[PDB]
Symmetry: D2
Subunit: 215 residues, 4 copies
C-alpha cells in the first residue's frame, strides 16, 4: 500500500526542506514536524475498535479507540532517521524503539547501479510480537532502497501484524523495488522523486538529510 501524503501542509514543509537556503535548526525541526504529521496519517490507518464511554452528564456513548497504538515498534535507521523518529514518538508514545546501522559494502570501484551490497554494523531491536505489532521503519530518504531492503530483510522475519515505512522523499526506483518485493507493506511518503543519479543521490531530492540536520 502506497500512501503519498502530498497535502498543502506537507508539501509546504517539504519545500522548505528542499530549499538549500534553509539552515540546520529549521531543516532539522521540519523533519521532526513531518514525523508527527506522517505519524498522524499512519494512525488513521491502524486497527481500532468501537468503545463506549460515559460523559459527565452521565450518557454512555460510543467512541473509537485505536488499540493498536499499544503495539508499535519504531525502528530508527541512523543517522538521519533520528529527527524523524523524534516527531514519530509524538504520535506513538507507547512504541519500543529499534536502532539500526547500515553501510554500503565498501567496494573500491564506484558502481552503485541497482545494488551497493549494504551491510549492518549495528542492530538493537526490541522483541517484535508476531502478527501483533505494527513495525514502523523510519528513514527520510529512500533512494536505491539498499538500506531499506536490508533492514526489511531482517524485520520481515519477525512476522509482525503490519509493516509501515515512513520517508519524506523516496525515489521512483526505490518505491517500486520495495513494494514489488513486499506488496503488503504500507509505504508512507510525502513526495516521490523521478530519478536518482549515478551516486545514488535522489533528484531533485534535497541534499544529505544527515549532514543538513546534524552538521
Amino acid at each position: 500500500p502506497l500512501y503519498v501524503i502530498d497535502k498543502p501542509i506537507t508539501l509546504h514543509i517539504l519545500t522548505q526542506l528542499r530549499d538549500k537556503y534553509t539552515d540546520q535548526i529549521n531543516f532539522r525541526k521540519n523533519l521532526v514536524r513531518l514525523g508527527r504529521i506522517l505519524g498522524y496519517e499512519i494512525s488513521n490507518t491502524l486497527d481500532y475498535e468501537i468503545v463506549e464511554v460515559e460523559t459527565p452528564l452521565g450518557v454512555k456513548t460510543k467512541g473509537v479507540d485505536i488499540t493498536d497504538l499499544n503495539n508499535i515498534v519504531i525502528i530508527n535507521i541512523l543517522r538521519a532517521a533520528v529527527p524523524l523518529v523524534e516527531g514519530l514518538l509524538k504520535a506513538f508514545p507507547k512504541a519500543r524503539q529499534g536502532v539500526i546501522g547500515a553501510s554500503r559494502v565498501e567496494v573500491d570501484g564506484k558502481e552503485v547501479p541497482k545494488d551497493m551490497d549494504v551491510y549492518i554494523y549495528y542492530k538493537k531491536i526490541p522483541d517484535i510480537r508476531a502478527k501483533v505489532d505494527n513495525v514502523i521503519i523510519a528513514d527520510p530518504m529512500i533512494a536505491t532502497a539498499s538500506t531499506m531492503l536490508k533492514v526489511l530483510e531482517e524485520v520481515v522475519k519477525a512476522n509482525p501484524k503490519r509493516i509501515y515505512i515512513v520517508s519524506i522523499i523516496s525515489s521512483e526506483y526505490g518505491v517500486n523495488k520495495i513494494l514489488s518485493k513486499y506488496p503488503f507493506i504500507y509505504l508512507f511518503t510525502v513526495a516521490i522523486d523521478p530519478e536518482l543519479n549515478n551516486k545514488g543521490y535522489i533528484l531533485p531530492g534535497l541534499g544529505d538529510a544527515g549532514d543538513r540536520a546534524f552538521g
Copy 2:
C-alpha cells in the same frame, strides 16, 4: 462550509475527552492536541501559491507555499478556548491573537430557549485587515451558539478574507444557526452532537470544558 474532522485519530482523542474518568492534565492536554490537528486541517484549506526552490544539487524545482499562514488572526474566546488556542498557535505561529469575554445577560427566570442575550465584557482584538486576514475563532463547545454569534457579530464587521471556526463539539442546533446566518463561514469541528438540554448544555457532550480543563 462545514468540515467535520472525524478521522480515527480525532475521534480517538474526542473519546478520551468525553470520558469523565479523564483527569485534568489529560483533558487539557487533549484540547491542545486537537488544536494542533484541526489547526492542520484549516491549513490544508488556506490560499497558497506555487513556488520554485533550488535543491542542494542545484535543481530549481516547484513547491507549495501557504502564503496565508502570514495572515492569521486567532480569536481566543475565554475561558476554555485558551488550551485550544495553545495548540492552534502551533499551526499558526504568525497569528495575532484576539481575546474575548462574553456572559449571558443575567436574567433571573431560567429561560435559555434559542437565545440568552449574550453580552461582551472583555474585548481586545488586533487590527483585522479587510479581505486579507483569515480570522479563526476558537471555542471547544458551540452549544446554543449565543456566544459564537455574538463574537461573530463583531468580527464580520472587519470584513476579513475568510472566517474559520474551530470547535471540538458543536450542536446540531448551533451549527445550523451559524451557517444559515453566515453561509460563507468555514466551520471546523470534530463531532456534531444531536441535542442540548434546557440549560444549554450539549448532549451527549463532555461536561464543562472550562472546569474540566482549569479546575
Copy 3:
C-alpha cells in the same frame, strides 16, 4: 521572600524581550520559556519529603519527592500572563488554573500616582485549600502593583500554605509595595527596574507585553 533569578540564561532571554526589534513569535515564545525556567526555580523552593525507591538491580535507595507539586493553584492575570502561565504549566502539570481580569477604575483626569483604583471584572478561581495549596500568581509586569495587590487582596483570604508571584520585570516601587504589605510572599522575578513613568509604564521596561505578545 524576594528571589531575583538573574542568571545568564534568564538575563539572556530578558535582553531579547527588552529589545524592541524582537518580533511577536519570539517575544511570545520567550515568555513561555521563562515561565518554565522560573517555574523550575519555584520548584526548588517547594516542600518535599525524602523517599525510598527500589532500583532495578534491587537496591532500595533514598530520593526526593516534591509532594507539593500536587498542591498548585496557578492564577493567570489576563492578558499577558497567558503565555507566561503556558510555560508555568510545564513545571506544574498538576495545577488548577484561576483566571482574573482587572481594570483601572476609569477616572478621566490622568492621575496614576501610587494608586489607580483597580477593579476586577472577571474572576474564576478553583477552590484554594487553606494552608495546603501554594498559590502562584503570574503576570510578567509588576509596575505600580495596583493589579497584583488587587488580585492578592482576594487570594490572601483563601489562606493558602504559600503564595508565590512570578513576574519577568517588576519595579522598585511595586516590589516594595507588595512585600511590605505581604512580607510572607515569595516574589520571583528576573529583573527589578529602577522606575516607572507617570503613566505607570516601567522604565527601562520592555514595552507592552500584552500587545508585544498578542498584537
Copy 4:
C-alpha cells in the same frame, strides 16, 4: 570542574528514573527533561558578553548575550544518549551534532576490572573549531568511563575551547578517572553513585538506561 546538579527538581526526576516501577514513556521523557535542565546549567557557565538593547520607550539599556550558544557541538553517544541529547538540543538549538558508537572489545573471559578495551565502530562528528567550540558529550551513565574516555580520546585532539560532559548518574570511580586524566573538563551530573559491580553496572544506579528507554 565538577558540577553536581543535585537540586530538588533534579533529584526529584532522578528518583523517578531510579524507581524500577517507572514505565518507558516516563523514563524516556525524564531523560529528555533532565537534558533540558542540565542544558540550562551548562548555559549559565558559558562565555557571554554584555550588550546594549533599545527598549520600546526608547531606552538603550545593558543586557547579557551568551554568544557561545553559537559554538556548540553536541556529541551523542549511542544508544541511550539520544533522549538526553533530545532535551539538550532544546537548550542548544545552534549545535552541530556528532554521533558515536563504542563496543567493549569482545574478550571472552568476563574481566571488566578498570578497563574493557573499548572500540569505536561508528563515528560522525562535524568539524570542531579549535579553541572556539564548546564540545558537549552526552551519555546518561558514566560507569567505568571506558566509553567516555574512549570518546574523549578523539575529541581532545580537536582542541576545542571547552569540553563539557553531561551525565545523569556517574560513578565515584568514573568521575575521578576522567577528571584526573582531563582536569580542565567541565563534568556535569546529577548524582554520583558510590560503586559499580563486577559487571560494570553502577550501584545503586538505575538499570539499563538504553533498554529502559528503548525496549
